[PDB]
Structures are given as structure tokens and as C-alpha cells.
Amino acid sequence: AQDDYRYIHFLTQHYDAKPKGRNDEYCFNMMKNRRLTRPCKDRNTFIHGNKNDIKAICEDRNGQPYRGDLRISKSEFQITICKHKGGSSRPPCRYGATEDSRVIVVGCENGLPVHFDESFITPRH
Known part of the structure; x- marks a missing residue:
């Protein structure tokens, strides 16, 4: 079908893949690179994981319906x-x-x- 226009925006914003540095200057170089975090927007999650598995959180199975609209994933992703x-x-x-x-x-x-x-917390943290 080739529906690869819509959530490319999502995967630019959040998703990354390969944090080579999970430090501080990692995130500061991504502050400069991504530049949607001016003048220093505070919290921002990057997801790392398989890209096809981010897509397949919007299955229904591999991301089950939470609160009748939302999804909660199957796999633990790195955030x-x-x-x-x-x-x-x-x-x-x-x-x-x-x-x-x-x-x-x-x-x-x-x-x-x-x-x-x-907003999702585990009951560990």
C-alpha cells in the first residue's frame, strides 16, 4: 500500500535507534540535531528498538488495546x-x-x- 508518510513524523520525533551514548552529551547533541527542544524543552523520550515493532504496536495483538483506544506494547522497548x-x-x-x-x-x-x-509507569518504577 505504501503508507509511509504519516508516522515518519512520529519516528523522527521520538524514535531513534542506536543510542551510542546514553549519557548527557548524547542527548545534548540530539538537542542540537533534532532542534525541537529550544530553548531547552525538558523531557523527551527516544525509543530504541525494532522499527517494525514500533509499527506493530498498532497491531492489536502485539500492542493490545489499553483503555479502549490506546495501545500498550508487548515488548519492552528501550526508552x-x-x-x-x-x-x-x-x-x-x-x-x-x-x-x-x-x-x-x-x-x-x-x-x-x-x-x-x-505517562506509563511500571509498578517497579
């Missing part, structure tokens, strides 16, 4: 949450990369995963 620590004004802002490795709640629009909830 590197660049969460801005320290002084929040001018660059160098830097970021507190707090990694979790957990199931994610996303939401689908159209039947493709568009939304990302950063």
Missing part, C-alpha cells in the same frame, strides 16, 4: 528519556538521560502509532 537537569536557560543546558527498559503506552491514530504517552 532513553532525556530529561533536562540542571540550569534551564541557555545552552549548555544538558540532559539527564534516565534510561528505562520497559513497555510503553502509545496511542494510534489511523491505525498507525502516532502518539506517545510518557
Whole structure:
């Protein structure tokens, strides 16, 4: 069908793949690169994982319906949450990369995963 226009926006924003650095200057170089985080937008999750498996959170099986609209994934995805620590004004802002490795709640629009909830907590954290 080739419906690869819609959630490319989603996978630019959130999804990454290969955090080669899960540090601070990782997230600061992604602050500069992605540039939707000016003047230092604080929290922002990147997801790392298989790209086809992000797509297949909007199956129904491999991401089951949570709260009659939303999806909760099957697989634990890596999430590197660049969460801005320290002084929040001018660059160098830097970021507190707090990694979790957990199931994610996303939401689908159209039947493709568009939304990302950063609200989902595990009962471990």
C-alpha cells in the first residue's frame, strides 16, 4: 500500500535507534540535531528498538488495546528519556538521560502509532 508518510513524523520525533551514548552529551547533541527542544524543552523520550515493532504496536495483538483506544506494547522497548537537569536557560543546558527498559503506552491514530504517552509507569518504577 505504501503508507509511509504519516508516522515518519512520529519516528523522527521520538524514535531513534542506536543510542551510542546514553549519557548527557548524547542527548545534548540530539538537542542540537533534532532542534525541537529550544530553548531547552525538558523531557523527551527516544525509543530504541525494532522499527517494525514500533509499527506493530498498532497491531492489536502485539500492542493490545489499553483503555479502549490506546495501545500498550508487548515488548519492552528501550526508552532513553532525556530529561533536562540542571540550569534551564541557555545552552549548555544538558540532559539527564534516565534510561528505562520497559513497555510503553502509545496511542494510534489511523491505525498507525502516532502518539506517545510518557505517562506509563511500571509498578517497579
